Amino acid sequence: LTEEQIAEFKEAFSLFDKDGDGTITTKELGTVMRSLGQNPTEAELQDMINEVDADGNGTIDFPEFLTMMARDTDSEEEIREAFRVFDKDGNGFISAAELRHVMTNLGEKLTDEEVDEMIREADIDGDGQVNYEEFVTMMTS
Amino acid sequence: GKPVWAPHPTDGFQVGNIVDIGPDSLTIEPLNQKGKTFLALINQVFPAEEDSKKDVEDNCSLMYLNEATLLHNIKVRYSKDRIYTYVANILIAVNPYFDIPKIYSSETIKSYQGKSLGTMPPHVFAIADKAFRDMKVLKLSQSIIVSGESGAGKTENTKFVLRYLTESYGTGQDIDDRIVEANPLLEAFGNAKTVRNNNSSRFGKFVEIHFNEKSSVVGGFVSHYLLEKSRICVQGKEERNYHIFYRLCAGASEDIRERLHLSSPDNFRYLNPLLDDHGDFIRMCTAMKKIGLDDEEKLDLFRVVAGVLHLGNIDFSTQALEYCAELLGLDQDDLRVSLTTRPLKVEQANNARDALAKTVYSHLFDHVVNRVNQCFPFETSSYFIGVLDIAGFEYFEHNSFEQFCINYCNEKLQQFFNERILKEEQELYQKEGLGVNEVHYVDNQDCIDLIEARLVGILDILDEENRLPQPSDQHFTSAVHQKHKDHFRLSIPRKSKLAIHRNIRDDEGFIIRHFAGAVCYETTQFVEKNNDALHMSLESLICESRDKFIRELFESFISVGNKFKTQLNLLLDKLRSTGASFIRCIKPNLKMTSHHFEGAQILSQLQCSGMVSVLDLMQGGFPSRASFHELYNMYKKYMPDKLARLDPRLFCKALFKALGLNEIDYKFGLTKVFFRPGKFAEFDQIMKSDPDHLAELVKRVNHWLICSRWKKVQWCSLSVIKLKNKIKYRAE
Ligand SMILES: Nc1ncnc2c1ncn2[C@@H]1O[C@H](COP(=O)(O)OP(=O)(O)O)[C@@H](O)[C@H]1O
Ligand code: BEF
Ligand SMILES: [Ca+2]
Ligand SMILES: [Ca+2]
Ligand SMILES: [Ca+2]
Ligand SMILES: [Ca+2]
Numbered sequence: 001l002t003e004e005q006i007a008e009f010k011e012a013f014s015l016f017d018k019d020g021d022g023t024i025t026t027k028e029l030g031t032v033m034r035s036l037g038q039n040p041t042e043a044e045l046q047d048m049i050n051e052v053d054a055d056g057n058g059t060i061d062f063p064e065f066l067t068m069m070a071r072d073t074d075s076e077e078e079i080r081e082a083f084r085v086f087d088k089d090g091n092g093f094i095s096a097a098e099l100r101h102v103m104t105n106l107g108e109k110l111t112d113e114e115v116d117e118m119i120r121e122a123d124i125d126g127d128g129q130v131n132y133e134e135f136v137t138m139m140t141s
Numbered sequence: 142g143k144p145v146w147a148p149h150p151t152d153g154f155q156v157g158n159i160v161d162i163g164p165d166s167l168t169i170e171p172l173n174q175k176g177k178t179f180l181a182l183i184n185q186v187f188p189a190e191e192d193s194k195k196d197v198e199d200n201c202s203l204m205y206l207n208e209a210t211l212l213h214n215i216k217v218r219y220s221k222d223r224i225y226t227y228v229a230n231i232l233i234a235v236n237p238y239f240d241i242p243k244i245y246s247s248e249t250i251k252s253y254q255g256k257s258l259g260t261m262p263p264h265v266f267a268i269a270d271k272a273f274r275d276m277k278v279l280k281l282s283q284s285i286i287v288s289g290e291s292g293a294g295k296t297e298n299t300k301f302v303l304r305y306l307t308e309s310y311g312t313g314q315d316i317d318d319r320i321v322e323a324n325p326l327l328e329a330f331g332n333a334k335t336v337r338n339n340n341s342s343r344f345g346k347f348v349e350i351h352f353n354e355k356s357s358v359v360g361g362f363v364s365h366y367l368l369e370k371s372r373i374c375v376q377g378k379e380e381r382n383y384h385i386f387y388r389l390c391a392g393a394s395e396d397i398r399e400r401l402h403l404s405s406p407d408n409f410r411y412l413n414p415l416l417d418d419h420g421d422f423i424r425m426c427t428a429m430k431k432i433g434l435d436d437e438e439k440l441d442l443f444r445v446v447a448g449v450l451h452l453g454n455i456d457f458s459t460q461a462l463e464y465c466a467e468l469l470g471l472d473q474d475d476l477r478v479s480l481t482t483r484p485l486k487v488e489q490a491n492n493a494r495d496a497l498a499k500t501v502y503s504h505l506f507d508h509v510v511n512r513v514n515q516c517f518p519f520e521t522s523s524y525f526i527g528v529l530d531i532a533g534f535e536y537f538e539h540n541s542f543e544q545f546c547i548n549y550c551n552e553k554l555q556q557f558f559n560e561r562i563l564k565e566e567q568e569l570y571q572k573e574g575l576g577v578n579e580v581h582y583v584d585n586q587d588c589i590d591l592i593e594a595r596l597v598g599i600l601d602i603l604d605e606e607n608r609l610p611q612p613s614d615q616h617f618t619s620a621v622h623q624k625h626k627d628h629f630r631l632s633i634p635r636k637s638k639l640a641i642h643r644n645i646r647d648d649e650g651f652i653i654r655h656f657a658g659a660v661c662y663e664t665t666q667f668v669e670k671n672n673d674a675l676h677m678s679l680e681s682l683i684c685e686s687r688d689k690f691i692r693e694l695f696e697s698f699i700s701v702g703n704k705f706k707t708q709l710n711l712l713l714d715k716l717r718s719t720g721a722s723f724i725r726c727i728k729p730n731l732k733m734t735s736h737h738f739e740g741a742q743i744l745s746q747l748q749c750s751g752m753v754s755v756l757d758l759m760q761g762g763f764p765s766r767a768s769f770h771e772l773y774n775m776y777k778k779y780m781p782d783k784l785a786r787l788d789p790r791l792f793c794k795a796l797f798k799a800l801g802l803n804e805i806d807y808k809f810g811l812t813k814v815f816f817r818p819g820k821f822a823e824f825d826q827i828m829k830s831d832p833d834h835l836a837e838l839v840k841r842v843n844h845w846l847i848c849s850r851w852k853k854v855q856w857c858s859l860s861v862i863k864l865k866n867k868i869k870y871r872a873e
């Protein structure tokens with residue numbers, strides 16, 4: 001992973017590490033995955049933990065989190081799928097109401113204006129919605 | 142121009158103003174008294190917090206962390222019945238001398254289970270919880286070292302720890318009750334009413350709770366140190382002997398009283414309020430028949446106690462010798478001869494009786510502690526949590542052998558404390574990204590070696606004297622002065638600035654420069670006090686007792702100092718294998734009263750407990766630190782609700798983007814913001830300036846903020862997807 005990419009994953013990691021000590025468990029891992037439309041079982045989570053949990057306590061730091069993430073056509077297929085997590089009805093555009101759903105699922109607090117503001121700033125063409133290319137451009141800023 | 146803290150003879154520090162600056166000292170005018178003026182050395186003057194009304198839960202959240210702001214913050218909290226405050230991972234506890242309402246309730250115990258330090262108000266329960274959590278996660282034994290002077294609160298807080306661990310992580314069940322009843326039983330035999338404390342510990346203890354691999358309680362073990370022998374026979378004007386003697390007389394049945402020939406305490410030489418001797422006997426009997434002591438063993442203990450009492454009544458009476466020899470199973474005529482023949486003078490016969498009394502009682506205390514250990518034993522264990530409860534450095538107008546032993550103990554304990562605090566601060570810097578922490582302490586190994594080194598240490602020099610044909614306190618003192626003439630830590634009493642110490646001759650004492658200050662030891666009775674072996678004629682007498690119990694208490698020179706050195710070294714072996722937390726207990730006044738903060742007295746304790754050395758170790762390149770969560774809590778009221786809706790981490794990155802604070806002065810860490818000297822004070826003042834200017838600074842950072850909020854959730858959804866695939870990728 002590049003220098004830019006590692007910094008963006010660190011901020012993402014803070015949604016997992018809500019109490020802010022630099023540490024993850026299976027509880028955190030599960031909560032966040034479900035809140036984005038995924039249902040991993042207890043054993044699946046524990047099985048993935050083992051990869052980089054040298055000391056058998058069930059804890060994980062950020063750099064270990066990155067290698068737990070590591071595995072040709074697969075890259076773009078993942079960014080397409082990330083977009084569809086936001087675009088719930090699959091019509092090709094992210095609406096204010098859809099962003100808010102994602103936002104609030106992840107425990108973020110903001111007003112409905114603030115949701116509209118996030119849409120407006122990501123909206124290059126100015127149609128009040130966020131398509132795939134605007135989503136990618138924002139992710140890459 | 143700003144007020145500062147400067148010395149005050151009774152408050153420790155007072156608010157004042159610098160009115161003139163000289164080469165060595167500053168001129169101070171007190172706020173209270175215009176026209177009044179005084180001098181203070183430049184290193185005795187400290188910056189004050191701008192807000193004098195606030196208090197923080199962790200003294201690390203102070204703009205300036207120093208002895209004076211620490212004292213003030215602790216004072217503010219104390220006035221509001223908040224007796225607990227942090228200095229990073231260290232807990233300070235101020236004795237309130239009354240019962241505060243919710244603080245120790247079983248409901249309060251529950252509310253602390255599982256929580257990290259700082260997510261709840263500061264509490265001894267939070268220290269106990271961190272010990273268990275670190276044991277479970279790090280697979281490492283834990284120690285909690287609790288110090289302070291007599292009456293400061295060590296025993297009470299130790300008991301709070303033991304109650305917390307037992308109610309929270311105990312078994313069921315039944316070992317639990319025994320663990321919390323162990324201390325109360327040892328106290329009958331080891332505690333005594335003193336001028337400083339009605340329930341004073343006259344011994345040191347280390348109390349271990351042992352666990353298995355699953356970190357379930359499997360047993361306990363109690364270590365005991367330095368039982369005070371002199372107290373058995375004579376005691377000071379306003380003081381008592383060990384509680385047991387007074388409880389036995391007060392609350393025994395007509396039956397026990399009859400068999401043991403017991404009267405009121407005024408009838409016994411060895412014994413002559415808010416002290417419920419009668420009720421305490423009942424509680425002691427409850428605790429005895431709960432650790433599994435039967436009435437047979439209980440009476441065996443009472444007999445020995447009573448026998449020591451009647452031995453004390455022998456002056457150099459007839460009925461006293463009768464009662465004594467019966468309860469200790471001796472021949473009346475054998476006791477008479479041994480107590481009176483080498484013929485012996487009046488003083489020499491008083492010594493023989495007192496020596497037997499002390500040896501019997503001491504050996505009885507050993508039996509009690511071993512008996513408590515037999516009530517919660519264990520085949521094997523994985524880890525322990527140990528609480529150390531022993532007296533700290535303290536002022537005494539006369540320093541003898543007892544003081545010498547405890548001060549030596551505290552040198553080694555303070556060395557451990559320095560080593561562990563240094564390690565935490567070094568670990569903090571690298572973990573947070575700050576590189577090398579260059580802080581250091583001055584080691585005290587040279588003072589440790591002066592006392593304990595083989596062949597040349599004071600302890601070995603003392604033993605040598607005990608073994609001479611004609612042992613002498615003065616020969617011993619000269620030997621020390623001769624061997625250590627030019628040691629940095631040792632001096633002759635006549636160099637003192639105190640006139641009383643200067644009247645002590647060279648062979649009558651010495652000065653040692655201890656961690657906490659110079660102590661002048663008077664060496665009279667050192668040689669006597671270093672030997673706790675009973676004379677062979679008295680030793681044979683008590684060994685051939687008709688009572689099985691008395692013979693088993695015992696089933697020529699024995700060094701008191703070297704026995705303790707061995708014990709202390711094993712304790713340190715243990716402690717060095719553990720992760721350590723530190724509780725510093727503080728006695729607020731000399732009167733046992735609540736809401737009465739004596740500043741100079743408290744300040745002096747903060748120095749003797751090692752909290753001044755500690756603060757120096759926390760003045761690294763970045764002497765100020767606060768976590769994103771606490772800065773968020775502290776300063777969100779000053780920002781627009783937009784910013785207040787984050788996310789303590791993003792809140793802080795936002796704040797330091799919008800204020801544009803230099804990357805040199807303000808270091809964003811992994812979990813904390815670190816401030817250069819004075820910079821936290823600068824930040825605080827900026828935060829409290831024009832609210833509108835602040836609003837405009839946020840506005841200018843709007844675009845970057847929105848993009849960051851977007852990127853946080855986009856990369857997190859990628860993350861989840863990448864993790865989802867890993868489950869599949871590893872499944873196929
Ligand atoms: N946290 C506390 N709450 C209520 N009373 C306390 C507390 N700490 C100490 N005390 C009181 O002060 C007395 C002396 O405390 P103790 O724990 O025996 O001090 P030490 O062991 O340091 O000599 C206790 O008997 C108790 O009355
Ligand atoms: F009086 Be205490 F138990 F140091
Ligand atoms: Ca965490
Ligand atoms: Ca791990
Ligand atoms: Ca849509
Ligand atoms: Ca658009």
Ligand SMILES: [Mg+2]
Nearest residue numbers: 295296341342
């Ligand atoms: Mg005590």
